[PDB]
Design a protein that fits this description.
The structure is cut from a larger assembly and holds two copies of chain A and four copies of chain B. By secondary structure, chain A is an alpha+beta fold. Chain A has helices at 2-7, 64-80, and strands at 15-16, 42-43, 47-48. A two-stranded antiparallel sheet of chain A has the order 2-3. In chain A, 16% of the residues are buried. The two termini of chain B are 44 Å apart. Classes of the chains: A alpha+beta, B mainly alpha. Chains A, D: Belongs to the p22likevirus portal protein family.
């Protein structure tokens, strides 16, 4: 299950309105040719673009239940897979 | 669509503003229509920043052809509505008016929908940096001495 | 349903706005009905972004057929209310009017319900990445040399 | 019981309004072909979409009662399963 | 219940709005009743999203039968109040009116109660995943080689 | 574009303010046009801070040529709207007026779009510092005794 979390889960990337980065889309593709990132500010109908702190997709995380149960199952198999104390 | 020319867009905007329509008893002077067409052309030039702005298929008329009104705008079916709505918001100040809230909301929604597909198409990830190795898993690249990504 | 044509939707919207109805003594000019039909067609084209927007079954009339009013809209029974409520909201500014709050709320709810099923159908999980192993548990895949997922 | 928590529990995914991601649904399916995520901003009736911080489904967690009781039961069995001190 | 037809629901909605009643001296034109019935049918179709929405037992009339008014709605006894309150709220804008706060509150409460039982019935837990073992405690399944849950 | 001269920009600004137009019965005195042209020239000089400000292609008239009105402004097609909207905003106080909210919003948006491309072009990363080594990986530079970056 945990492996499925690593592969099929969206990565951590910013959430953008299309109008926020209109015309600056080449600044966010991953290159390092610019000293900063530019954002559009004005709108011809709303006057100014609304203010909202940038939100990023959360990083994938292994649930506490998964880790706890994996550790518990491994410990159980370790404890039960002891023949005798030795195969006398 | 029945809105196939620039003048059709101008008439739609004027009907939206309530200034004039095919049902009213007094229509605007043809000079007012020419001014509205000029405003529409200026707005389309502003949106289409020489290909780096909003792509809509709008066809810009030339100076050689006398009547600016009468040529097909070239817009797609989904692009027409937004256009004339925005046009209303840009020509309301001429008649000492102010477009109602619904017109402004529809203009915002239409512009967003207009740029949605271009924004999707422009969300391209940059290639690998020139200093990043390909890895030994890429057997084909490693055998052909392509140990590092090209870049650019 | 009794609402089977585009003109029926236009009359329903006008009745919602109180502009005209089959009970009133003065009905709008047929040019106003044509303008409302044009607005409905533009709105539907805007919603249906060439198949990438809101799927409704709306049938877009062609230029060869003279009357745009009279053709069946093709909408399902559950879509008529949202369509004509949004049409009333859109054509309210024509008559220097403003749709009441109930009409706006109904239009929002109807559009949300219209896109609900399409949104459910479009919530598809991407396939496994090309660099992800299938695992030794998949005996059939591993016996046929399918150690890694195809991808794409 | 803990195993039932691991398998039959919805995992951590964002809560979205259908109109927030209308037209951008292929951006959230789990691929890595985009530099960011785009969100719809405007509504033709409400003017602008309401602002609300993104909510994620909570990760599955083993309750403190379950872990405490598993440890207590294991300790009790360990202590009581001692014949004598030796089988004299 | 004395409300056994669609027209009974329409009359109850009109009475709730104070527009028309069996006690008033002026009743609405039968065309207004037909329009209200059309609105009720559209609202019911919108709620009942082809079986994936609110289930109420409402019977949709067919085009072959001439009078849409006169057929039993088929609703339960507990659903009539919500239906006609929502209908009054929906048809209030026709007469340049606005339903009072009590009517809107009753409509909200009735719709919630309408969907309560269906929401209870639709809260079904998904089966065990296909990769989850049954466990050795399930002796019957383990003896019959059912070491893993089927899934789907 | 039909706006090809400074006077065309002034006339568009006056029309946007509702002060004068080709449709009205009273047009401003030519001295008012000259004053508006002077204001436009001052605003363009302020924007174009001797090449370190907003680059637009505007051509500044010389004192030798008598008529300041009549010369082509030299602006691009996408710059006309922003220029004349800002001009309308700037010359509104002359006639004891105040530009409406839409005009100010359009002026802000147009100025932002005007400077967008120049801002993109001016976001240049500084070269490596003079004290930064090139590294042994750069075999060509190391063999040619270029152990450190030049800088400046």
């Amino acid at each position: 299950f945990n492996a499925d979390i690593v592969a099929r889960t969206p990565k951590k990337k910013p959430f953008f309105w299309p109008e926020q980065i209109a015309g600056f889309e080449h600044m966010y593709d991953g290159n390092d040719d610019y000293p900063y990132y530019l954002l559009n500010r004005t709108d011809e109908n709303s006057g100014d673009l609304p203010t909202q702190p940038l939100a990023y997709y959360e990083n994938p995380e292994v649930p506490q239940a998964n880790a706890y149960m994996l550790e518990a199952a491994t410990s159980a198999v370790k404890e039960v897979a002891t023949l005798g104390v030795e195969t006398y | 669509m029945q809105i196939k020319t620039k003048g059709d867009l101008v008439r739609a905007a004027l009907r939206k503003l309530g200034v004039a329509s095919d049902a009213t008893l007094t229509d605007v002077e043809p000079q007012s229509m020419q001014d509205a067409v000029d405003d529409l052309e200026a707005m389309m030039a502003e949106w289409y920043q020489d290909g780096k702005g909003i792509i809509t298929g709008y066809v810009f008329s030339d100076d050689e052809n006398p009547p600016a009104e009468g040529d097909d705008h070239g817009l797609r079916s989904s692009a027409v509505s937004a256009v004339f709505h925005n046009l209303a918001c840009r020509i309301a100040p001429d008649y000492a008016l102010e477009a109602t809230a619904k017109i402004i909301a529809t203009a915002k929604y239409g512009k967003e929908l207009l740029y949605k597909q271009t924004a999707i198409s422009r969300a391209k990830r940059a290639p690998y940096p020139s200093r990043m190795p390909t890895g030994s898993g890429n057997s084909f690249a490693n055998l052909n001495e392509w140990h590092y990504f090209p870049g650019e």
